[PDB]
Every structure is written in structure tokens, then in C-alpha cells.
PDB file of C-alpha atoms and ligand atoms in Angstrom:
ATOM      1  CA  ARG S   1      81.652 -22.207  73.877  1.00  0.00           C
ATOM      2  CA  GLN S   2      83.892 -19.172  73.823  1.00  0.00           C
ATOM      3  CA  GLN S   3      86.651 -22.866  73.235  1.00  0.00           C
ATOM      4  CA  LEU S   4      83.919 -24.649  70.791  1.00  0.00           C
ATOM      5  CA  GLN S   5      84.218 -20.500  68.637  1.00  0.00           C
ATOM      6  CA  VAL S   6      88.052 -21.322  68.810  1.00  0.00           C
ATOM      7  CA  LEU S   7      88.110 -24.858  67.465  1.00  0.00           C
ATOM      8  CA  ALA S   8      85.553 -23.903  65.004  1.00  0.00           C
ATOM      9  CA  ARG S   9      88.089 -21.275  63.394  1.00  0.00           C
ATOM     10  CA  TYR S  10      90.902 -23.705  63.688  1.00  0.00           C
ATOM     11  CA  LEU S  11      89.212 -26.434  61.554  1.00  0.00           C
ATOM     12  CA  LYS S  12      87.334 -23.545  58.928  1.00  0.00           C
ATOM     13  CA  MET S  13      83.775 -24.997  60.152  1.00  0.00           C
ATOM     14  CA  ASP S  14      81.351 -22.436  59.721  1.00  0.00           C
ATOM     15  CA  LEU S  15      78.503 -23.215  62.397  1.00  0.00           C
ATOM     16  CA  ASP S  16      76.082 -20.763  60.814  1.00  0.00           C
ATOM     17  CA  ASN S  17      76.782 -22.166  57.132  1.00  0.00           C
ATOM     18  CA  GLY S  18      73.092 -24.167  57.814  1.00  0.00           C
ATOM     19  CA  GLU S  19      71.111 -21.445  58.747  1.00  0.00           C
ATOM     20  CA  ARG S  20      71.806 -18.926  56.311  1.00  0.00           C
ATOM     21  CA  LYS S  21      70.901 -21.348  53.373  1.00  0.00           C
ATOM     22  CA  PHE S  22      67.827 -22.321  55.321  1.00  0.00           C
ATOM     23  CA  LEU S  23      66.832 -18.127  55.621  1.00  0.00           C
ATOM     24  CA  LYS S  24      67.240 -18.612  51.526  1.00  0.00           C
ATOM     25  CA  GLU S  25      65.339 -21.557  51.083  1.00  0.00           C
ATOM     26  CA  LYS S  26      62.256 -19.831  53.833  1.00  0.00           C
ATOM     27  CA  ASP S  27      62.894 -16.465  52.092  1.00  0.00           C
ATOM     28  CA  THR S  28      62.480 -18.690  48.536  1.00  0.00           C
ATOM     29  CA  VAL S  29      59.249 -21.056  49.972  1.00  0.00           C
ATOM     30  CA  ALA S  30      57.486 -17.390  50.557  1.00  0.00           C
ATOM     31  CA  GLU S  31      58.124 -16.510  47.389  1.00  0.00           C
ATOM     32  CA  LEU S  32      56.687 -19.239  45.449  1.00  0.00           C
ATOM     33  CA  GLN S  33      53.651 -19.080  48.144  1.00  0.00           C
ATOM     34  CA  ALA S  34      52.400 -15.779  46.854  1.00  0.00           C
ATOM     35  CA  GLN S  35      53.178 -16.537  43.788  1.00  0.00           C
ATOM     36  CA  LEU S  36      50.644 -19.959  44.033  1.00  0.00           C
ATOM     37  CA  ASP S  37      48.472 -17.613  46.521  1.00  0.00           C
ATOM     38  CA  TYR S  38      48.081 -15.367  43.215  1.00  0.00           C
ATOM     39  CA  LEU S  39      46.723 -17.399  40.674  1.00  0.00           C
ATOM     40  CA  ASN S  40      44.328 -18.851  43.948  1.00  0.00           C
ATOM     41  CA  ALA S  41      42.716 -15.542  43.778  1.00  0.00           C
ATOM     42  CA  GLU S  42      43.177 -14.924  40.005  1.00  0.00           C
ATOM     43  CA  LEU S  43      41.097 -18.574  39.000  1.00  0.00           C
ATOM     44  CA  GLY S  44      39.822 -19.403  42.417  1.00  0.00           C
ATOM     45  CA  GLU S  45      39.975 -23.201  43.817  1.00  0.00           C
ATOM     46  CA  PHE S  46      37.185 -24.808  41.846  1.00  0.00           C
ATOM     47  CA  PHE S  47      39.216 -23.911  39.282  1.00  0.00           C
ATOM     48  CA  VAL S  48      43.526 -24.736  40.089  1.00  0.00           C
ATOM     49  CA  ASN S  49      41.968 -28.287  41.848  1.00  0.00           C
TER      50      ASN S  49
ATOM     51  CA  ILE R   1      44.450 -37.242  77.694  1.00  0.00           C
ATOM     52  CA  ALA R   2      40.625 -39.721  77.478  1.00  0.00           C
ATOM     53  CA  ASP R   3      40.213 -40.237  73.819  1.00  0.00           C
ATOM     54  CA  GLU R   4      36.301 -39.989  71.930  1.00  0.00           C
ATOM     55  CA  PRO R   5      35.621 -40.773  69.113  1.00  0.00           C
ATOM     56  CA  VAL R   6      33.813 -37.177  67.277  1.00  0.00           C
ATOM     57  CA  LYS R   7      30.273 -37.323  67.588  1.00  0.00           C
ATOM     58  CA  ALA R   8      27.738 -37.655  64.746  1.00  0.00           C
ATOM     59  CA  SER R   9      25.880 -34.853  66.645  1.00  0.00           C
ATOM     60  CA  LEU R  10      29.404 -32.191  65.167  1.00  0.00           C
ATOM     61  CA  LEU R  11      30.337 -34.306  61.795  1.00  0.00           C
ATOM     62  CA  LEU R  12      26.774 -33.007  60.799  1.00  0.00           C
ATOM     63  CA  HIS R  13      26.894 -29.546  62.349  1.00  0.00           C
ATOM     64  CA  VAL R  14      30.479 -28.936  60.400  1.00  0.00           C
ATOM     65  CA  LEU R  15      29.679 -30.131  57.503  1.00  0.00           C
ATOM     66  CA  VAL R  16      26.183 -27.456  57.226  1.00  0.00           C
ATOM     67  CA  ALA R  17      28.053 -24.747  59.047  1.00  0.00           C
ATOM     68  CA  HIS R  18      30.986 -24.938  56.099  1.00  0.00           C
ATOM     69  CA  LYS R  19      28.737 -25.985  53.297  1.00  0.00           C
ATOM     70  CA  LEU R  20      26.170 -22.307  54.106  1.00  0.00           C
ATOM     71  CA  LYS R  21      29.555 -20.711  55.063  1.00  0.00           C
ATOM     72  CA  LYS R  22      28.384 -19.449  58.900  1.00  0.00           C
ATOM     73  CA  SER R  23      28.604 -20.631  62.407  1.00  0.00           C
ATOM     74  CA  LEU R  24      28.661 -22.887  64.509  1.00  0.00           C
ATOM     75  CA  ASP R  25      26.394 -20.909  66.587  1.00  0.00           C
ATOM     76  CA  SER R  26      24.896 -18.817  63.592  1.00  0.00           C
ATOM     77  CA  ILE R  27      24.095 -22.520  62.846  1.00  0.00           C
ATOM     78  CA  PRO R  28      20.477 -23.756  65.457  1.00  0.00           C
ATOM     79  CA  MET R  29      19.651 -27.793  65.517  1.00  0.00           C
ATOM     80  CA  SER R  30      16.655 -27.469  65.699  1.00  0.00           C
ATOM     81  CA  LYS R  31      16.044 -25.496  61.921  1.00  0.00           C
ATOM     82  CA  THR R  32      15.316 -28.313  59.362  1.00  0.00           C
ATOM     83  CA  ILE R  33      18.064 -28.346  56.783  1.00  0.00           C
ATOM     84  CA  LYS R  34      15.365 -26.311  54.199  1.00  0.00           C
ATOM     85  CA  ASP R  35      14.240 -23.521  56.573  1.00  0.00           C
ATOM     86  CA  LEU R  36      18.629 -22.840  56.999  1.00  0.00           C
ATOM     87  CA  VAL R  37      18.961 -22.897  52.431  1.00  0.00           C
ATOM     88  CA  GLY R  38      16.091 -20.507  52.046  1.00  0.00           C
ATOM     89  CA  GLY R  39      14.771 -21.670  49.179  1.00  0.00           C
ATOM     90  CA  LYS R  40      17.919 -22.500  46.931  1.00  0.00           C
ATOM     91  CA  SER R  41      16.964 -26.009  45.849  1.00  0.00           C
ATOM     92  CA  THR R  42      20.724 -25.767  44.472  1.00  0.00           C
ATOM     93  CA  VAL R  43      22.491 -25.456  47.860  1.00  0.00           C
ATOM     94  CA  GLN R  44      20.327 -27.913  49.868  1.00  0.00           C
ATOM     95  CA  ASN R  45      21.101 -30.812  47.147  1.00  0.00           C
ATOM     96  CA  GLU R  46      24.583 -30.347  48.087  1.00  0.00           C
ATOM     97  CA  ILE R  47      24.584 -30.722  51.906  1.00  0.00           C
ATOM     98  CA  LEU R  48      22.586 -33.354  51.299  1.00  0.00           C
ATOM     99  CA  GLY R  49      25.293 -35.153  49.600  1.00  0.00           C
ATOM    100  CA  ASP R  50      27.886 -34.391  51.718  1.00  0.00           C
ATOM    101  CA  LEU R  51      25.892 -36.027  54.275  1.00  0.00           C
ATOM    102  CA  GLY R  52      25.080 -38.833  51.966  1.00  0.00           C
ATOM    103  CA  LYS R  53      29.074 -38.775  51.330  1.00  0.00           C
ATOM    104  CA  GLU R  54      30.059 -39.026  54.521  1.00  0.00           C
ATOM    105  CA  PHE R  55      27.944 -41.406  56.704  1.00  0.00           C
ATOM    106  CA  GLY R  56      26.581 -43.349  53.906  1.00  0.00           C
ATOM    107  CA  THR R  57      22.956 -43.558  54.025  1.00  0.00           C
ATOM    108  CA  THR R  58      20.714 -40.909  54.121  1.00  0.00           C
ATOM    109  CA  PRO R  59      17.468 -41.308  55.617  1.00  0.00           C
ATOM    110  CA  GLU R  60      13.927 -41.128  53.535  1.00  0.00           C
ATOM    111  CA  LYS R  61      12.913 -37.447  54.436  1.00  0.00           C
ATOM    112  CA  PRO R  62      15.860 -35.594  54.982  1.00  0.00           C
ATOM    113  CA  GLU R  63      15.476 -32.518  54.133  1.00  0.00           C
ATOM    114  CA  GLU R  64      11.417 -31.578  56.283  1.00  0.00           C
ATOM    115  CA  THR R  65      13.782 -33.229  59.432  1.00  0.00           C
ATOM    116  CA  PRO R  66      15.206 -31.023  61.690  1.00  0.00           C
ATOM    117  CA  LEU R  67      19.168 -31.549  62.598  1.00  0.00           C
ATOM    118  CA  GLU R  68      19.234 -32.771  66.278  1.00  0.00           C
ATOM    119  CA  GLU R  69      17.061 -35.659  64.848  1.00  0.00           C
ATOM    120  CA  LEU R  70      19.461 -36.401  61.455  1.00  0.00           C
ATOM    121  CA  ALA R  71      22.498 -36.396  64.123  1.00  0.00           C
ATOM    122  CA  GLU R  72      20.676 -38.972  66.218  1.00  0.00           C
ATOM    123  CA  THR R  73      19.319 -40.911  63.493  1.00  0.00           C
ATOM    124  CA  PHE R  74      23.254 -41.578  62.079  1.00  0.00           C
ATOM    125  CA  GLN R  75      24.821 -41.839  65.542  1.00  0.00           C
ATOM    126  CA  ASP R  76      23.174 -45.385  65.394  1.00  0.00           C
ATOM    127  CA  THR R  77      25.134 -46.420  62.230  1.00  0.00           C
ATOM    128  CA  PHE R  78      28.131 -44.029  62.483  1.00  0.00           C
ATOM    129  CA  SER R  79      30.798 -45.485  63.912  1.00  0.00           C
ATOM    130  CA  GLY R  80      33.803 -42.369  64.905  1.00  0.00           C
ATOM    131  CA  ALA R  81      36.079 -41.978  61.819  1.00  0.00           C
ATOM    132  CA  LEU R  82      36.024 -39.440  59.303  1.00  0.00           C
ATOM    133  CA  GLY R  83      34.954 -40.605  56.785  1.00  0.00           C
ATOM    134  CA  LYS R  84      35.643 -39.049  52.729  1.00  0.00           C
ATOM    135  CA  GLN R  85      34.547 -35.675  52.506  1.00  0.00           C
ATOM    136  CA  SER R  86      35.877 -34.623  56.113  1.00  0.00           C
ATOM    137  CA  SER R  87      38.415 -36.115  55.046  1.00  0.00           C
ATOM    138  CA  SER R  88      39.491 -33.641  52.110  1.00  0.00           C
ATOM    139  CA  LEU R  89      37.602 -30.822  53.276  1.00  0.00           C
ATOM    140  CA  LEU R  90      40.254 -31.179  56.248  1.00  0.00           C
ATOM    141  CA  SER R  91      43.463 -31.733  53.846  1.00  0.00           C
ATOM    142  CA  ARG R  92      41.981 -28.647  51.642  1.00  0.00           C
ATOM    143  CA  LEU R  93      41.530 -26.140  55.296  1.00  0.00           C
ATOM    144  CA  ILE R  94      45.361 -27.701  55.634  1.00  0.00           C
ATOM    145  CA  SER R  95      46.701 -27.052  52.237  1.00  0.00           C
ATOM    146  CA  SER R  96      44.783 -23.685  51.961  1.00  0.00           C
ATOM    147  CA  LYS R  97      45.518 -21.822  55.471  1.00  0.00           C
ATOM    148  CA  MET R  98      48.915 -23.550  56.481  1.00  0.00           C
ATOM    149  CA  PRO R  99      52.284 -22.321  55.802  1.00  0.00           C
ATOM    150  CA  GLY R 100      54.234 -24.094  53.045  1.00  0.00           C
ATOM    151  CA  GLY R 101      55.546 -26.857  55.263  1.00  0.00           C
ATOM    152  CA  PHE R 102      53.134 -26.953  58.492  1.00  0.00           C
ATOM    153  CA  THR R 103      51.057 -30.074  57.067  1.00  0.00           C
ATOM    154  CA  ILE R 104      48.190 -31.900  58.554  1.00  0.00           C
ATOM    155  CA  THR R 105      50.352 -34.381  60.875  1.00  0.00           C
ATOM    156  CA  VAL R 106      52.630 -31.408  61.841  1.00  0.00           C
ATOM    157  CA  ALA R 107      49.040 -30.221  63.482  1.00  0.00           C
ATOM    158  CA  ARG R 108      48.129 -33.250  64.513  1.00  0.00           C
ATOM    159  CA  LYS R 109      51.707 -33.779  66.605  1.00  0.00           C
ATOM    160  CA  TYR R 110      51.150 -30.275  67.798  1.00  0.00           C
ATOM    161  CA  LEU R 111      48.000 -31.320  69.170  1.00  0.00           C
ATOM    162  CA  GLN R 112      49.044 -34.615  71.004  1.00  0.00           C
ATOM    163  CA  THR R 113      52.337 -32.503  72.459  1.00  0.00           C
ATOM    164  CA  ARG R 114      50.841 -29.111  73.270  1.00  0.00           C
ATOM    165  CA  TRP R 115      47.641 -29.830  74.452  1.00  0.00           C
ATOM    166  CA  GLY R 116      48.266 -33.878  75.003  1.00  0.00           C
ATOM    167  CA  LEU R 117      44.617 -34.603  72.503  1.00  0.00           C
ATOM    168  CA  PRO R 118      44.242 -38.149  70.769  1.00  0.00           C
ATOM    169  CA  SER R 119      43.484 -38.888  67.503  1.00  0.00           C
ATOM    170  CA  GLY R 120      39.852 -38.521  68.292  1.00  0.00           C
ATOM    171  CA  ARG R 121      39.779 -35.373  69.873  1.00  0.00           C
ATOM    172  CA  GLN R 122      42.543 -34.426  67.102  1.00  0.00           C
ATOM    173  CA  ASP R 123      39.411 -35.153  64.688  1.00  0.00           C
ATOM    174  CA  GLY R 124      36.852 -32.988  66.548  1.00  0.00           C
ATOM    175  CA  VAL R 125      39.479 -29.993  66.699  1.00  0.00           C
ATOM    176  CA  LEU R 126      39.894 -29.759  63.233  1.00  0.00           C
ATOM    177  CA  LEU R 127      36.330 -30.334  62.510  1.00  0.00           C
ATOM    178  CA  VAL R 128      36.013 -27.016  64.402  1.00  0.00           C
ATOM    179  CA  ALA R 129      39.365 -25.557  62.779  1.00  0.00           C
ATOM    180  CA  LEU R 130      37.190 -25.885  59.634  1.00  0.00           C
ATOM    181  CA  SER R 131      34.111 -25.009  61.016  1.00  0.00           C
ATOM    182  CA  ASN R 132      36.153 -21.344  61.385  1.00  0.00           C
ATOM    183  CA  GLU R 133      38.691 -21.250  58.179  1.00  0.00           C
ATOM    184  CA  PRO R 134      39.956 -17.767  58.300  1.00  0.00           C
ATOM    185  CA  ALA R 135      39.696 -15.565  55.244  1.00  0.00           C
ATOM    186  CA  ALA R 136      43.299 -16.065  53.741  1.00  0.00           C
ATOM    187  CA  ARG R 137      46.975 -18.352  54.598  1.00  0.00           C
ATOM    188  CA  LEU R 138      48.100 -17.871  57.742  1.00  0.00           C
ATOM    189  CA  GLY R 139      51.556 -15.540  56.911  1.00  0.00           C
ATOM    190  CA  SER R 140      54.197 -18.001  60.191  1.00  0.00           C
ATOM    191  CA  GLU R 141      53.809 -20.844  61.982  1.00  0.00           C
ATOM    192  CA  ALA R 142      53.742 -18.844  65.372  1.00  0.00           C
ATOM    193  CA  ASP R 143      50.331 -17.586  64.527  1.00  0.00           C
ATOM    194  CA  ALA R 144      49.201 -21.415  62.870  1.00  0.00           C
ATOM    195  CA  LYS R 145      49.854 -22.584  66.283  1.00  0.00           C
ATOM    196  CA  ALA R 146      47.845 -19.843  68.237  1.00  0.00           C
ATOM    197  CA  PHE R 147      44.954 -20.849  65.606  1.00  0.00           C
ATOM    198  CA  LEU R 148      45.400 -24.368  66.620  1.00  0.00           C
ATOM    199  CA  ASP R 149      45.148 -23.024  70.392  1.00  0.00           C
ATOM    200  CA  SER R 150      41.661 -21.114  70.082  1.00  0.00           C
ATOM    201  CA  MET R 151      40.044 -23.908  68.088  1.00  0.00           C
ATOM    202  CA  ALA R 152      41.338 -26.581  71.066  1.00  0.00           C
ATOM    203  CA  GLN R 153      39.094 -23.682  73.479  1.00  0.00           C
ATOM    204  CA  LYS R 154      36.316 -23.355  70.947  1.00  0.00           C
ATOM    205  CA  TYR R 155      36.161 -27.312  70.786  1.00  0.00           C
ATOM    206  CA  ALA R 156      36.617 -28.348  74.179  1.00  0.00           C
ATOM    207  CA  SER R 157      34.269 -25.434  75.154  1.00  0.00           C
ATOM    208  CA  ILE R 158      31.319 -26.966  72.830  1.00  0.00           C
ATOM    209  CA  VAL R 159      32.262 -30.135  73.881  1.00  0.00           C
ATOM    210  CA  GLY R 160      33.685 -29.953  77.458  1.00  0.00           C
ATOM    211  CA  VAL R 161      36.725 -31.088  78.354  1.00  0.00           C
ATOM    212  CA  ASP R 162      39.306 -28.990  80.435  1.00  0.00           C
ATOM    213  CA  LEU R 163      42.822 -27.388  79.011  1.00  0.00           C
TER     214      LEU R 163
HETATM  215  O1  LIG U 201      17.161 -26.611  43.478  1.00  0.00           O
HETATM  216  P1  LIG U 201      16.081 -27.455  42.452  1.00  0.00           P
HETATM  217  O2  LIG U 201      13.696 -26.169  43.016  1.00  0.00           O
HETATM  218  O3  LIG U 201      15.380 -28.662  42.968  1.00  0.00           O
HETATM  219  O4  LIG U 201      16.771 -26.693  41.500  1.00  0.00           O
HETATM  220  C1  LIG U 201      15.876 -25.706  40.571  1.00  0.00           C
HETATM  221  C2  LIG U 201      17.022 -25.368  39.535  1.00  0.00           C
HETATM  222  C3  LIG U 201      15.670 -25.775  38.130  1.00  0.00           C
HETATM  223  C4  LIG U 201      15.535 -23.404  38.744  1.00  0.00           C
HETATM  224  C5  LIG U 201      17.864 -25.235  39.525  1.00  0.00           C
HETATM  225  O5  LIG U 201      18.698 -26.563  39.724  1.00  0.00           O
HETATM  226  C6  LIG U 201      18.478 -24.342  38.737  1.00  0.00           C
HETATM  227  O6  LIG U 201      19.213 -23.355  38.543  1.00  0.00           O
HETATM  228  N1  LIG U 201      19.053 -24.886  37.134  1.00  0.00           N
HETATM  229  C7  LIG U 201      20.018 -24.150  35.937  1.00  0.00           C
HETATM  230  C8  LIG U 201      19.042 -23.586  35.359  1.00  0.00           C
HETATM  231  C9  LIG U 201      18.991 -25.477  34.307  1.00  0.00           C
HETATM  232  O7  LIG U 201      17.878 -26.340  34.956  1.00  0.00           O
HETATM  233  N2  LIG U 201      19.094 -25.105  33.479  1.00  0.00           N
HETATM  234  C10 LIG U 201      19.483 -26.691  32.500  1.00  0.00           C
HETATM  235  C11 LIG U 201      21.085 -26.748  31.760  1.00  0.00           C
HETATM  236  S1  LIG U 201      21.100 -28.081  30.571  1.00  0.00           S
HETATM  237  C12 LIG U 201      20.130 -27.786  29.138  1.00  0.00           C
HETATM  238  O8  LIG U 201      19.901 -26.529  29.949  1.00  0.00           O
HETATM  239  C13 LIG U 201      20.064 -28.767  28.797  1.00  0.00           C
HETATM  240  C14 LIG U 201      19.256 -28.148  27.618  1.00  0.00           C
HETATM  241  C15 LIG U 201      17.678 -28.322  27.311  1.00  0.00           C
HETATM  242  O9  LIG U 201      19.515 -27.503  26.155  1.00  0.00           O
END
């Protein structure tokens, strides 16, 4: 694993880029889920569907 | 494990229980639909419509017939497939209560992997999940799997299976 991180650093291949991006999209999702839950509360299941 | 199609007696129970917004144990089979509703013909007619949609046909006097005698009358012509009402209610449960990313097929997968319950008994667990619908959408994946676990144990208790 220490030889892998040395080979990454040489090639300039950020290993965690994919996990960083995933955590931004997952915080965006949790913001939109909060906005839809608020509209489903102020209008109701029957109305929104 | 052993694959069983959901009994009409459980489907009927869950549909009544969900419409009245009460737990399965709070609804006794002995009582008639007309007794349970409590003089509100609107809700009575909403239950009758949902059972008529789900099972296709109804008996001649479904109002005065007790729930165990309706469940036995439906089992004579019931196959084991959910139908047009159960399928839609489960889709509305999953969409409205599971976290953004968790679909029905992920629930079906989780039940087939974690518990090993096949499609026939997945449908049963999902019906027990419908009967005990939570208040607000489950925040994370881990408490959504913990809910599916609590519904598997409830399903296993009522049907009489060991997990
Ligand atoms: O359960 P049930 O006893 O069979 O139903 C009882 C009643 C009729 C009371 C129930 O369905 C109900 O509450 N209905 C709403 C009141 C009502 O009948 N409103 C009529 C809406 S249409 C209309 O009013 C046409 C018009 C004359 O202009």
C-alpha cells in the first residue's frame, strides 16, 4: 500500500478524487430531498401525486 | 429458504390496517369492516373499493362478513401475486420513506442477501413494512436496513419462520 501511494504520487493520480466528488453529490441529494420533503409537507401526498 | 406466496389473510389484514391507520394487532379478525370503521360509510366504501381492486371480485355482503371469512372467500380464487393496489402502496412507501438512492429493488436485494428471503416472502416483509409505516423519511441507509430487519423479524413472528 506504501508502494502504491508512491506510484500514485509519481503518476499524479489522485486516488480519493472519486470519493470526494461522491460526498459533494450526496450532500446535494440530501439538500434536494429536504426541499421535496418540505413541499410534500405543505401540500400533502394527494396533491403532489 | 422455502418460498411461499403471501396469504390473502395477511394482504387483507395489511390493506384494512393501512387504510384505518392502525397496527395489525389493533385490528382483530373477528370484527366486521362495518364495526371497525365506526359508522363512517365513506372509509368503509374506500376499503371495499381497495379490496375489490386487489382481489378483482368481492362476496355479496362484504360489510357484515368478518375479516377471517373474507380472507377464506378470497383464498379460493387468490393466486399469490400482490396485484394493482399492493404494488402501488409499496412504491409510495419506498419512494416517500427510503433515502434518495434506495429503490424497491435494493430492498428486495437486501432481503435476498442479508436474510435470504425469496421474492414470495420479500412481498410479505414489504406488506409488514407498509402496516408499520414510519412518520418521517429514514435519514440514512443504515437505519433503513435496521427498519427492514425489524420488519423481517415481525414477518417471521406472524407467519411462524426462524431467521
Ligand atoms: O358512508 P355513507 O353513509 O354511505 O355516506 C354518507 C354521506 C352522504 C353523508 C357521505 O358520502 C358524505 O359525507 N358526502 C358528502 C356530502 C354530500 O353528499 N355532498 C354532495 C356533493 S355533490 C352536490 O352537492 C351536488 C349538488 C346538489 O349541487
